[PDB]
């Protein structure tokens, strides 16, 4: 939800791969706005998570 740290982490990982020639893992913690499919109802199993979701602004805004 903070893009300016995502950019820095990606840059650092790209430098690490060139400097040490090892694997590196980058984990992006986010959420899923819709259901698993476009025609899907996610409220059947995760009611409160999606009640919280529909009160949150998109990152672009």
């Amino acid at each position: 939800d903070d893009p300016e740290a995502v950019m820095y982490v990606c840059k650092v990982a790209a430098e690490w791969r060139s400097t040490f020639h090892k694997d590196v893992v980058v984990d992006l913690v986010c959420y899923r706005r819709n259901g698993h499919n476009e025609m899907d109802e996610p409220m059947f199993t995760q009611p409160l998570m999606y009640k919280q979701i529909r009160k949150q602004k998109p990152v672009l805004q």
């Binding site: 109802e41 409220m43 059947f44 009611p47």
Partner: protein
């Protein structure tokens, strides 16, 4: 070797259907779309017909 018949008497089937087409705890709220599904289950159960989901309960 032989196998007994697997049928059941009707009252058992009706009791299972009635339990399967409802929510048997008090104070429990459920989604609208799920309420329609349970109501349709009752629709079928009162007409003496089973869909695929009701046979698994029975």
């Amino acid at each position: 070797m032989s196998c007994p018949s697997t049928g059941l008497t009707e009252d058992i089937l009706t009791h299972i259907g009635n339990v399967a087409s409802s929510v048997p705890v008090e104070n429990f709220t459920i989604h609208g779309g799920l309420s329609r599904i349970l109501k349709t289950r009752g629709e079928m159960v009162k007409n003496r017909t089973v869909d695929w989901a009701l046979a698994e309960y029975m």
